[PDB]
Design a protein around this ligand. Structure first.
Ligand code: NA
Lengths: 303, 24
């Protein structure tokens, strides 16, 4: 990706302004629940202003930084895709479950992940990638050994390095692994995305067996799903107490969110920060709460 | 009623929050 200068950033801001104006169309009636594009693009704008202010008089330093070059290219691309969604979608955008509205929700989730990453790498607007603290010690040691203090690596280099410790099946498993870890959908793995993935699928010692058991062969796992989409999806099981699904929390990145149908026909969502996901699912099954993953009668045996 | 469209630089994120409840 090319060098970033102030003129590229301001062009991106103009495109972002066009998106937030399109999204305020009263016929659209977007709900305010996270991930909310009308929160996320303004917050992204404000954080980018903070970054540019920290680099006043040294914009060349910022604009040559590899992570920032990739980030700005991706933000521009994804903002243009959102505009194209409105121009191709026209009145279909006003229908809640239309293809363009589902695409807008997926993009909203991607913008949320991008913002979180940007703040993890530039917490007060200054680049802090070289001292980024990976949460799990065994995962931190992997990154230090393979990549030093690097903040971002291409997917193919990341795959090759990870395969040395946790072998990866070629084909669709490798594709599914990439889709899980590449939260910002940019074909790179940042140290932030690595931190999130290794928190979600801890312990490191069995990382990809955990991921396979919780995300590939578990029908309860939902990729790129929001809180409101979980409520919608479980509505058809409101008559089947114990139906449940789980996904990444979008506002507490690195935490899981489990949605379930209660005995009195409510849909609740909970974040099991007290214990690992494996254990939350095991305990919830034994206690009668997490019985029917995505409404199915058979539940995986995580023992 | 007016529907005032706010610009990118005028929106202070509402930061509205989804309801997460204690484990069952
Ligand atoms: Na990525």
């Amino acid at each position: 990706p090319g060098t970033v200068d102030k003129k590229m950033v301001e062009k991106c801001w103009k495109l972002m302004d066009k998106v937030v104006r399109l999204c305020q169309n009263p016929k659209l009636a977007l709900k305010n629940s996270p991930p909310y594009i009308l929160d996320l693009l303004p917050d992204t704008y404000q954080h980018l202003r903070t970054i540019l202010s920290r680099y006043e008089g040294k914009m060349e330093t910022l604009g040559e930084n590899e992570y920032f070059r990739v980030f700005m290219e991706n933000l521009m691309k994804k903002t243009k895709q959102t505009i194209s969604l409105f121009k191709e979608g026209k009145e279909r955008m006003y229908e809640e479950n239309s293809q363009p509205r589902r695409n807008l929700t997926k993009l909203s989730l991607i913008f949320s992940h991008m913002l979180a990453e940007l703040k993890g790498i530039f917490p007060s607007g200054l680049f802090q990638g070289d001292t980024f603290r990976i949460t799990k010690a065994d995962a931190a040691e992997f990154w230090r050994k393979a990549f030093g203090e690097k903040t971002i690596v291409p997917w193919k280099s990341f795959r090759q390095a990870l395969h040395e410790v946790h072998p990866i099946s070629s084909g669709l498993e490798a594709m599914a692994l990439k889709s899980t870890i590449d939260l910002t959908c940019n074909d790179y793995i940042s140290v932030f995305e690595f931190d999130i993935f290794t928190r979600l699928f801890q312990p490191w010692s069995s990382l990809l067996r955990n991921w396979n058991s919780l995300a590939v062969t578990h029908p309860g796992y939902m990729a790129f799903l929001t809180y409101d989409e979980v409520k919608a999806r479980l509505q058809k099981f409101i008559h089947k107490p114990g139906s449940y699904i789980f996904r990444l929390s979008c506002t507490r990145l690195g935490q899981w969110a489990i949605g379930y149908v209660t005995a009195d026909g409510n849909i609740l969502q909970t974040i099991p920060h007290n214990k690992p996901l494996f254990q939350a699912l095991i305990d919830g099954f034994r206690e009668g709460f997490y019985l029917f993953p995505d409404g199915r009668n058979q539940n995986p045996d995580l023992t | 009623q007016q529907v005032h469209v706010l610009s990118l630089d005028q929106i202070r994120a509402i930061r509205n929050t989804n309801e997460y409840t204690e484990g069952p």
